[PDB]
Amino acid sequence: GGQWRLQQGLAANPSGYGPLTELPDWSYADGRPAPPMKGQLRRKAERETFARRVVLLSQEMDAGLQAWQLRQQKLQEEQRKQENA
Amino acid sequence: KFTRSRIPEKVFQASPEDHEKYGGDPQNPHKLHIVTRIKSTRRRPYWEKDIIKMLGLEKAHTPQVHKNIPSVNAKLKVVKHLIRIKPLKLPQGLPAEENMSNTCLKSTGELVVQWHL
Amino acid sequence: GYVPKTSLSSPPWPEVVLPDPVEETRHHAEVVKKVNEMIVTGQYGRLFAVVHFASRQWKVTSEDLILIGNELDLACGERIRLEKVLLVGADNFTLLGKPLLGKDLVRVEATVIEKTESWPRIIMRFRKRKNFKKKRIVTTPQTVLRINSIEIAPCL
Amino acid sequence: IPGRQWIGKHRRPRFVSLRAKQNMIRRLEIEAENHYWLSMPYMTREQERGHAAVRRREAFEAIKAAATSKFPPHRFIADQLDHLNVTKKWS
Amino acid sequence: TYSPLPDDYNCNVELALTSDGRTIVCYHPSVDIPYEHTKPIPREEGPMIEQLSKMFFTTKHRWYPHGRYHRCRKNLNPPKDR
Amino acid sequence: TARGTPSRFLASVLHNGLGRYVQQLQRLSFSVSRDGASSRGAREFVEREVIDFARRNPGVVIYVNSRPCCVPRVVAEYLNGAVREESIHCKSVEEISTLVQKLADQSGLDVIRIRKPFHTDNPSIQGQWHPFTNKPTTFRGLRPREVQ
RNA sequence: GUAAAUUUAACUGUUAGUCCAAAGAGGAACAGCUCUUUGGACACUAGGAAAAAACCUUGUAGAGAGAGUAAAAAAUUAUCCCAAACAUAUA
């Protein structure tokens, strides 16, 4: 059952993102933790690249909106110095 | 003969009923798309294959983000029957550099920074 | 709002009704207090823990062995603890997480006894009429863990 | 039945199960949602024009540098003179 | 003794949640079998196969012997589980 | 293939994790040739790595023969009598180090198939299932359709 | 959105097939018949439709005694029939 999991905002596959896979799977006896799983490293890298791509697209299209605004304003202002005398 | 398809644009004039059905917001329209492939490229023509190789959608059920520019919409409008596109809502703003290696994505379509394992 | 009794007007399933929520909570508090005093005194005996170590679920008890199909980056005879315990049970009581159980209510130890590589397994692909005949030998690495103890603690 | 039983005038028509119809409806509702989320773009076409030109240009320049960069690898004296120790001894 | 499901066919088990909600505790004791439900102790090679067929209720096929090939492939010292 | 080869059940030597852990390998026996190409990768292992391997776990007695032969080999004698012979001819440094570490980090039991991934010696805490668990009892023990 | 395209030097090989949807021609608006075209698949993996190259779902490949899904269940009143059954326990 995984349609119910989605209508409750969970990963449909319990081996996806959740407590079961994110948390470390072991620890040394005294208590000092142990180097993470290579799956954890791989998924941290993939999520990092995803976030960076989101930043790139968002801020570049905003820069495009700003550039279009100033281009239209340049058209407006250099339309105004042709109306003297 | 079989050809490409030209969808009439009237299929994309969302109604107010649609707005209140899905998470509608006509004005202040959403910035990005998160797109996931849910069908095979095989048994489907070659230009669909090329598009699904252009939008980064090689593996199925692997989400990839894209702009909402009409160019990418004109690409998605011919592989729409192989993709599930959901808005990437950002309840709190896009992450900063220090807290970027500690972010994660929820199945409801939201990117969130507070992901302590 | 009335229907004469008939074989199909009513629902065949016997319509149960749930207990009153407040009395239900009081009952739940009483029984958890009972299990808590059982754990604090020492009633239990041996314990079995359903654990989620490193690929999949193992049902584990004291003294026993578990073969994992991958290396674990640990010297031989180097004590370890297994977090992610999703069931722990004794003769009379058993606790299930939702999904997991805190790192204080259940403590599962372990040791590594041997690191081996599995027996040589064969991958052969073959197709008829095409001279397609591929052969390969694979030796997965494995490590065997002795589960040492499973200590439950009163914190409920 | 004449032969090649799945064709011919007296073909056997397959039946439409309920779960196949339910699958059709699932895909079709997903399509309706796609139609919605393609029904409102951010930037009109006149606005996007050239906004990401710099990124594409630098990516293509990276491609060009990679293409132009192919050349034989170096050749060191150490390799040729370290093959000469397949006759080590003890004495 | 709560019986939404009639927990009397076998025994009774009590369910509860710890106060916060992140652990579920179930109490199941070994119900003992009552006394007054108890009772007191009360104080020739074809017919061979047929009689063994009726006593153990298996059919006749498995009782005939097997040849040498099917009895050198049998494992004399099999591994011991547990 | 599985049918065509032996098998076993998951096992330790002497319940080798309960009280403690004892290294299973007692002995390693290197044979090397002073003047011979095949032993080259082994020769340096006697110069560079063997000293640190000998100190890095001291329960193993390491012998090195240094005969005037042409072939090397390593004999790994274990506590329970099993001898693992391994060939190191025409090998190099890193692979011989990996081999000797692999020998000194496994038990002596044969590498043949493992049938169960576990060896739970007391596989029940709550009472193994027989067909009468979960089956009710009746008044005076009347099997069905009886009278008295 | 992409990371590929064009050109130079260099040889071999195939060079056209079958079936399905679609527009058509011939033929009986038959043929597992012949012939053009746009697409798909096959001659490569796997699961389904009973068996099933050609229909539907799926691609990049190993180990696992872990999980979620895809397609996917037949309804109306001329040797020897051919799945056994079942109108209702919360999809």
CSV table of C-alpha atoms in Angstrom, one decimal, chain C residues 46-48 58-59 61-67 74-77 89-91 93-94 111-122 142 144 146-148, chain F residues 1-2 5 8 10-18 21 23-24 102 104-109 111-114 116-126:
chain,number,residue,atom,x,y,z
C,46,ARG,CA,14.9,-13.8,26.1
C,47,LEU,CA,14.1,-11.0,23.6
C,48,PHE,CA,13.7,-11.0,19.9
C,58,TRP,CA,16.4,-9.4,10.1
C,59,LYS,CA,14.7,-11.0,13.1
C,61,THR,CA,17.9,-12.7,19.1
C,62,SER,CA,20.8,-13.1,21.4
C,63,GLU,CA,23.8,-15.4,20.6
C,64,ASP,CA,22.8,-15.7,16.9
C,65,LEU,CA,24.5,-14.9,13.5
C,66,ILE,CA,23.5,-12.8,10.5
C,67,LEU,CA,25.1,-12.8,7.1
C,74,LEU,CA,35.3,-2.8,10.4
C,75,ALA,CA,38.1,-4.7,11.9
C,76,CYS,CA,37.5,-8.3,13.0
C,77,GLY,CA,36.0,-8.5,16.4
C,89,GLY,CA,9.4,-8.6,22.0
C,90,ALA,CA,9.6,-11.0,25.0
C,91,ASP,CA,7.3,-13.8,26.2
C,93,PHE,CA,4.9,-8.1,25.7
C,94,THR,CA,6.1,-6.7,22.4
C,111,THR,CA,30.2,-8.0,16.7
C,112,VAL,CA,31.8,-9.0,13.4
C,113,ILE,CA,33.1,-12.5,13.5
C,114,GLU,CA,34.4,-13.1,9.9
C,115,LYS,CA,34.6,-11.4,6.6
C,116,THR,CA,34.5,-13.7,3.6
C,117,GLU,CA,33.6,-13.6,-0.1
C,118,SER,CA,30.7,-15.7,-1.3
C,119,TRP,CA,31.1,-18.9,-3.3
C,120,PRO,CA,31.9,-18.4,-7.0
C,121,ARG,CA,28.5,-17.8,-8.7
C,122,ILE,CA,28.1,-18.0,-12.5
C,142,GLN,CA,30.0,-11.0,2.8
C,144,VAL,CA,28.9,-12.4,9.4
C,146,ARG,CA,27.2,-12.2,15.9
C,147,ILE,CA,24.3,-10.6,17.8
C,148,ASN,CA,25.4,-10.3,21.4
F,1,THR,CA,25.9,-24.5,-9.9
F,2,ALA,CA,24.1,-25.1,-6.6
F,5,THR,CA,28.3,-28.6,-5.5
F,8,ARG,CA,26.4,-26.0,4.5
F,10,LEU,CA,25.8,-20.6,8.6
F,11,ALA,CA,28.3,-21.4,11.3
F,12,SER,CA,31.1,-20.1,13.6
F,13,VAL,CA,33.9,-22.2,15.1
F,14,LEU,CA,33.4,-22.1,18.8
F,15,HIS,CA,30.6,-19.6,19.2
F,16,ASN,CA,33.3,-17.1,18.5
F,17,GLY,CA,31.5,-13.9,19.4
F,18,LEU,CA,29.8,-14.8,22.7
F,21,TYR,CA,36.7,-13.1,19.4
F,23,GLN,CA,41.5,-14.8,15.2
F,24,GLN,CA,40.9,-18.1,13.4
F,102,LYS,CA,41.4,-11.8,3.2
F,104,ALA,CA,43.6,-13.5,8.0
F,105,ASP,CA,40.0,-12.1,8.2
F,106,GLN,CA,37.9,-15.2,7.5
F,107,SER,CA,37.2,-18.5,9.3
F,108,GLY,CA,38.5,-21.8,8.0
F,109,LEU,CA,35.2,-23.1,6.9
F,111,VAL,CA,33.7,-21.3,1.0
F,112,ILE,CA,31.0,-23.5,-0.4
F,113,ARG,CA,27.4,-22.3,-0.5
F,114,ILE,CA,25.6,-20.9,2.5
F,116,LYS,CA,20.4,-19.9,5.4
F,117,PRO,CA,21.7,-16.3,5.9
F,118,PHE,CA,21.2,-17.0,9.7
F,119,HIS,CA,21.8,-19.6,12.4
F,120,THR,CA,19.3,-18.6,15.1
F,121,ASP,CA,20.1,-21.3,17.6
F,122,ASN,CA,17.0,-20.6,19.7
F,123,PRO,CA,14.6,-19.6,17.0
F,124,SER,CA,11.6,-19.0,19.2
F,125,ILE,CA,10.9,-17.0,22.4
F,126,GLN,CA,7.1,-17.2,22.4
